[PDB]
Amino acid sequence: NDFHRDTWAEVDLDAIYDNVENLRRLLPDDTHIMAVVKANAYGHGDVQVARTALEAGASRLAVAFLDEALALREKGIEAPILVLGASRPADAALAAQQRIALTVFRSDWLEEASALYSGPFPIHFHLKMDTGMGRLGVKDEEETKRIVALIERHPHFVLEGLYTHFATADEVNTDYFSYQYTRFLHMLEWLPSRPPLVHCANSAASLRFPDRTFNMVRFGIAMYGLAPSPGIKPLLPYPLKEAFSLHSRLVHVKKLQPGEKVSYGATYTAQTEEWIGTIPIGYADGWLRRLQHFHVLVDGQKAPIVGRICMDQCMIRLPGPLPVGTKVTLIGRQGDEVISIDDVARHLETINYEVPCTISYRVPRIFFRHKRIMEVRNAIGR
């Protein structure tokens, strides 16, 4: 794959490897690591992160919906995969054939699938229990038992696991976290037999209470080197290595005279003779307009973005005349300066999770491993 615009994201796979390996060391020998690679691996490249994670110690993968699981299969991933979200009963056969575990939380969904599927491949289900997140999952014992009965009844339906998800595992105060954990323990009693796989922990929970993880944790955000929250940053067991960085290059350089305006709405005016640079990145690439008063790194120095951000380009004020082709870093480090995803997240007034996911399909991903470029992934490549 090759690209023809001087704008690209870089993904350090050694960092991802280190982040997962350190966790493997942290957890008991019998606890499995299921790497969460939904949303194209939080914007980092699904199959590249999946391969690295499995290499570092993970044994299973998790995605959001069926399409994402099939894509990994097509791309050659053979490890077990669990779909964390909902799916259509009519799609049970397809999941069964591709060896994809499904989440289940309604007895009527199973009633429907039973009538549609009848072997020969077994379908592995993971029962979802709502302990206080309010998203997905069973809530009462009557429904739980009904689900287990329908599963037991069908010769090809297998209950491989059961889990829950925490709503506040990343807050310093553990009041609600404790309530959910306790609720989980109480709901587990409703099962006639404990499935081979019981899980509940995400990145925050597993990094904070590794002894309360059962037999499998679902490692997401922390795998990419990002803290589940600023609050627990100081409570993390080992230092996380950030893997994502974003860059571009100056495609135009010019000097403005005082009074000259820049960009849409002509909201910016040159107060004096200043140097303005143009870079090939805009909001269609995920660099949202709201970042208008942010800055970028060029020649090891911060350069403020001036005027409104455009769909594919934006302008910055330069220290002086720099040659066209000069590298600009939007997320990453240059010399002694650095811009982290957390910085950008602060400016956009959101969480770090949302940032890598918004960097669109338009931006190619360059992968590094062993300090060398591994491959280039251009979504709209030829």
Place this chain on the structure above:
Amino acid sequence: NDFHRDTWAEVDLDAIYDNVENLRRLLPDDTHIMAVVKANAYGHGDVQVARTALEAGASRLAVAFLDEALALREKGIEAPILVLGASRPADAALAAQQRIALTVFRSDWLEEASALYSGPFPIHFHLKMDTGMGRLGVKDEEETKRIVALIERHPHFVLEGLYTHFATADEVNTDYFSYQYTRFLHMLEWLPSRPPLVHCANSAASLRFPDRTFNMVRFGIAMYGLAPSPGIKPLLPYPLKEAFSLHSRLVHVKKLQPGEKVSYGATYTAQTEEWIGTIPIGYADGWLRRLQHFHVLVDGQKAPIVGRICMDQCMIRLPGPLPVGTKVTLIGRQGDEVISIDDVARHLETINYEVPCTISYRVPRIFFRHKRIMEVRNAIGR
């Protein structure tokens, strides 16, 4: 193409056709229409909109950078394409071979390209003039004349056109617009000869002053049925037809008792016994967290989104017990209610342009033409 998650966007190509056709009628028989389809056609599907546009009266296409043009060629589009942004001198031969016109605005670029390319295919260049936008383009006559000389000199370099872009054509006050237009007329005098294609108008300018468009207009936002701005909405010549709509379905329905919390941070509490529904769409699909206090349409009624929006799902408060599978409209109309892209943009505090572009690759696009489903485009399809 097929998809396995009940979340999808719908693109009405008949609306796009009408929007372009009405302009074709509005403009002089000699004026070309260049459809702007960069950024995957502002998130509507590049090749689908390009074909419909050409069918309705456009004769040329415009994209942001080389990769987007090559993708159209691979997909079978044979009409002329102009790259509006920057490109590498080393890529001139490739653009020449695929018959892609390039924007030029620096003489040093041309000096570099001349030394690299030497036929046999001619390269058509469009000279960009900065008249007050401050983005790309030449500024002084000395540089302009140098560009023309280098082009004239090379046997395979051809100056097919020249243009500028307006920073405020969508504001009711035309003071700056008038200054940019006047500056353009003065800079055109720097050319020893007028190229066969002179253009300057975007959607707002062409819809407002169709007689001041020269021989080609670059039709973008209005082609998608979106007003360049709320201010000029009442100044438009004909009514625009919105083409983008977004939908999903309830995948879970449950009743909450007072005091029960919902989603991350447990920031929402059920004040009474209320029905909560879960839908398979989140911020990784372009439905940003900031939309947390917005509302959606279900069963012809507005239903508020409650609690934080998740990466792949979010919850809403329902009127009562609705069956799973019930359709939810995020952008579009249901009964007497309607949510436009303009409504979503207001809540996100941005402009309509940014909304369809942010709806990610994860969301399949279903196309309609002649009141019938034409095709389905699933980016991560099998």
